[PDB]
Amino acid sequence: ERIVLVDNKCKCARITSRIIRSSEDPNEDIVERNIRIIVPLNNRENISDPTSPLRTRFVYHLSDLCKETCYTYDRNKCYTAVVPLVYGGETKMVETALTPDACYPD
């Protein structure tokens, strides 16, 4: 019944809207603004560099996500970083997988 205005998935906001066809009086129908933020609370600031500080401020300007610094990983998009792991002589900098089950190559 409702229409998704915003389905932003790197802050995880999800503003929708819906006209409530009321008790059958005149046009005293209401319109909604069902915001649904989901706050990470253990993701870092730089989402891809996991050696960063945690987070305190979560700022949601809901114009600037109706038209960046993402707070959550997106599920389908896959994230990486590069670490210096060694094994013997060399420091072979190979490419990890921050979120797995999404970085599986075809």
Partner 1 sequence: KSPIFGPEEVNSVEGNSVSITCYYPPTSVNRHTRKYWCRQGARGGCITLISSEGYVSSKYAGRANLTNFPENGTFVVNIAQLSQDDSGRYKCGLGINSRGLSFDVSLEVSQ
Partner 2 sequence: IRVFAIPPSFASIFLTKSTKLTCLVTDLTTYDSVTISWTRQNGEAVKTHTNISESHPNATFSAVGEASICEDDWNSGERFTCTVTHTDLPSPLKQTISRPLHRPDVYLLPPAREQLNLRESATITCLVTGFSPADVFVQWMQRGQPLSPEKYVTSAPMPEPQAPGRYFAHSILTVSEEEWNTGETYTCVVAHEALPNRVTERTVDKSTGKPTLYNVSLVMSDTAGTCY
Ligand X SMILES: *[C@@H]1O[C@H](CO)[C@@H](O[C@@H]2O[C@H](CO)[C@@H](O)[C@H](O)[C@H]2NC(C)=O)[C@H](O)[C@H]1NC(C)=O
Residues that bind ligand NAG (CB under 6 A): 32, 34
Q: Which does 73 bind (CB under 5 to 8 A by kind): partner 1, partner 2, ligand NAG, none?
A: partner 2
Tokens encoding 21 = 């066809």
Q: Are 45 and 64 in contact (CB under 8 A)?
A: no
Gap between the Cα atoms of 57 and 14, Å rounded? 19
- In angstroms, the CA 1 to CA 52 distance is 42
Which of ligand NAG, partner 2, ligand X, none does 46 bind, CB closer than 5 to 8 A by kind? Answer: ligand X
Which C-beta is closer to ligand NAG: that of 34 or that of 52? 34
- 98 belongs to the binding site for partner 1 (CB under 8 A): no
